[PDB]
Design a protein around this nucleic acid. Structure first.
Ligand SMILES: [Zn+2]
Ligand SMILES: [Zn+2]
Length: 205
DNA sequence: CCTGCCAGGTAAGTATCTCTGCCCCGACACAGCCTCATACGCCTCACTCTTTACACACACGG
């Protein structure tokens, strides 16, 4: 919406980089997920027409745009001049943008999201007209779902590397069999493996 | 212990090239401008058969 106040679009974009509980569980089969990446690294920014808009809300945030400026001032590699804003006071229709032209949304540091604007049209009925649900993700890709590699009847809850039983190196196991190729009879490691929690983005967001 | 003329056979002759040193050279670098010509390279696009996933359907059989 043209008054939706960015940091509202930001808080609503359903990516899976706002998931993926970190940490390696190689000796902890049953571990409480302490913090999803959404909670930990709340910093993010929108790049729009030279200017940056940094999510300065949530003072556990930081300035991800800063880094870029650091090498646009020294050793100019294209891109000339740059600017930065706060993204919190700024709402939509406060910008000076092009349509159909790629712009950036970087959240969680390295996930990059292109923010092409398809078209600006005035409000008209035959739509919701609501405000609560208004960001309104109306299309999504229906991605593929990574299933377990031992059995094919469940999804990939666990990703293991350097395993001692996995044919492939990054091997995706459902929780059932993951508990059965490792962690035997007391929940103690078998062989060697680095097991990380997998979110299976075909399922989420 | 040598020495030689004649017949027969043969034969002419005419008629109808591969190195090898060696002086007197072209083409290398490389300088700016400059215009158009040629080559390379790299990522974005296409597509195409062949699976790949996934909601749904439909007998099937006793
Ligand atoms: Zn993301
Ligand atoms: Zn399994």
């Amino acid at each position: 919406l043209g008054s939706q106040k960015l940091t509202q679009l930001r808080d609503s974009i359903r990516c899976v980089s706002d998931l993926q509980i970190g940490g390696e569980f190689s000796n902890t089969p049953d571990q409480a997920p302490e913090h999803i990446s959404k909670d930990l690294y709340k910093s993010a920014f929108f790049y729009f027409e030279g200017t940056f808009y940094n999510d300065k809300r949530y003072p556990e945030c930081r300035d991800l745009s800063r880094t870029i400026i650091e090498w646009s001032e020294s050793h100019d590699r294209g891109y000339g001049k740059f600017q930065t804003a706060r993204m919190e006071d700024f709402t939509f229709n406060d910008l000076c943008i092009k349509l159909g032209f790629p712009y950036l949304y970087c959240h969680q540091g390295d996930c990059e999201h292109v923010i092409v604007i398809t078209d600006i049209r005035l409000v008209h009925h035959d739509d919701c007209l609501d405000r609560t649900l208004y960001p309104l993700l109306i299309k999504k890709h229906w991605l593929w779902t990574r299933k377990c590699f031992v059995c094919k009847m469940y999804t990939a809850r666990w990703v293991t590397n350097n395993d001692s039983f996995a044919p492939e190196d990054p091997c995706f196991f459902c929780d059932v069999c993951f508990r059965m190729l490792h962690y035997d009879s007391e929940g103690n490691k078998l062989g060697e493996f680095l097991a990380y929690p997998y979110v299976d983005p075909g399922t989420f967001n």
